[PDB]
Amino acid sequence: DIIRNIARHLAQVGDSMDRSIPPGLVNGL
Amino acid sequence: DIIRNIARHLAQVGDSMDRSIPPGLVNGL
Amino acid sequence: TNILDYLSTERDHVMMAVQYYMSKQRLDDLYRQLPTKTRSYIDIINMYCDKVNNDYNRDMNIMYDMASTESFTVYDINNEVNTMLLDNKGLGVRLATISFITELGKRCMNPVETIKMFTLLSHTICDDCFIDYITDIS
Amino acid sequence: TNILDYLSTERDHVMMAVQYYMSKQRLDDLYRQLPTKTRSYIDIINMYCDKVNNDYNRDMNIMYDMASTESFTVYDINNEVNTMLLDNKGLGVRLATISFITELGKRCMNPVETIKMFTLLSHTICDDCFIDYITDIS
């Protein structure tokens, strides 16, 4: 439903923020 | 029990604060 | 009921931090949205409860330290308060009860039980009598 | 969900004022008691959620306005989040979820339901993954 869509949206936003951090600076990213 | 004692204490403190306000300044007091 | 005994693991620290962030953000935003009237009432409660806390410091402290010694429910605190406010229509007792319940909340580490207490007791405290005083003073 | 529609009577205003006083006093006191470590974590969450809110403003706003259109439970929000955090071990998604749940709380006028949501979702968000990030960054 909508809830699923929002949650998917949150992961997409989250992953794009992760990818904007230069690699190496945060362990695990 | 204790709860009753505390509640009674609250009313005593409350009434003494009420009596320390000059009469007339607060309607109902 | 010492804060450190509740913050044993890193998960405890991080969860505390997230819960604080959410609650603080919410409270700040709520105030930003409140009508001037409501803000005026908050200021009155602040000033008058500060007076009770000042003028009756030793009394209030005793009541806190007694609540420490015994275990009792929010329900029966509430019912004990409602009984007093039934036959005592003073302003003072309502202010003192707010200060007392507020202190109890500061000593409670369960956030859901705390808000439940604040919510229930605020209903009990805000009787027609209290509303008349607050609107008179404001 | 407009604040004014909830503040119709004087009793509504006064009860809001008392509940705000109790909650604000409690939150201020809690922070005053928190260990430096916990305070450091709060600052990190503040700074990183501010970055998400800034850098992805239009995205976050869309998610808010969609939550407005439909009705759903805290339970199923929670379960939808837990599912994402199971197979997505990124930092970003955890920060974004905090911002989202925080906004939902700002839009909720039921204080008990709000703290219940914050409490449940904070458990879900603070998995081993999140704790590892926060301790790494701090």
Numbering used by the authors:
A (entry chain B), B (entry chain B): 81 to 109
C (entry chain A), D (entry chain A): 64 to 201
Task: List passages from the publication reporting this PDB structure.
To investigate the molecular basis for Bid, Bak and Bax BH3 domain binding by VAR F1L, we determined crystal structures of VAR F1L in complex with Bak and Bid BH3 domain peptides. Unexpectedly, VAR F1L showed no detectable affinity for Bim BH3, and only weakly bound Bid from the BH3-only proteins with a KD of 3220 nM. Superimposition of bound Bak and Bid BH3 backbones indicate that both ligands are bound in near identical manner. In the VAR F1L:Bak BH3 complex, residues V75, L78, I81, I85 protrude into four pockets in the VAR F1L-binding groove, similar to the equivalent hydrophobic residues in Bid (I86, L90, V93, M97). Close examination of structures of VAR F1L complexes with Bid and Bak and VV F1L complexes with Bim and Bak did not reveal major differences in BH3 domain binding to the canonical binding groove that can explain the startlingly different ligand-binding behavior. Nonetheless, despite the inability to directly engage Bim, and the very modest affinity to Bid, VAR F1L is able to counter both Bim- and Bid-mediated apoptosis. VAR F1L protected against both BimEL (P=0.006) or Bid-mediated apoptosis (P= 0.0027), with comparable levels of protection observed with Bcl-2.
Variola virus (VAR), the causative agent of smallpox, is a member of the poxvirus family and belongs to the orthopoxviridae. The B-cell lymphoma 2 (Bcl-2) protein family is a key mediator for maintaining cell survival or to drive apoptosis, thereby removing infected, damaged or unwanted cells, and sequence, structural and functional orthologs of Bcl-2 have been found in a number of poxviruses. Here we report that despite possessing a nearly identical 3D structure and sequence, VAR F1L inhibits apoptosis via a different mechanism compared with its homolog in VV. As observed previously for VV F1L,22, 23 VAR F1L adopts a Bcl-2-like fold that forms a domain-swapped Bcl-2 with similar binding grooves that engage BH3-domain ligands.
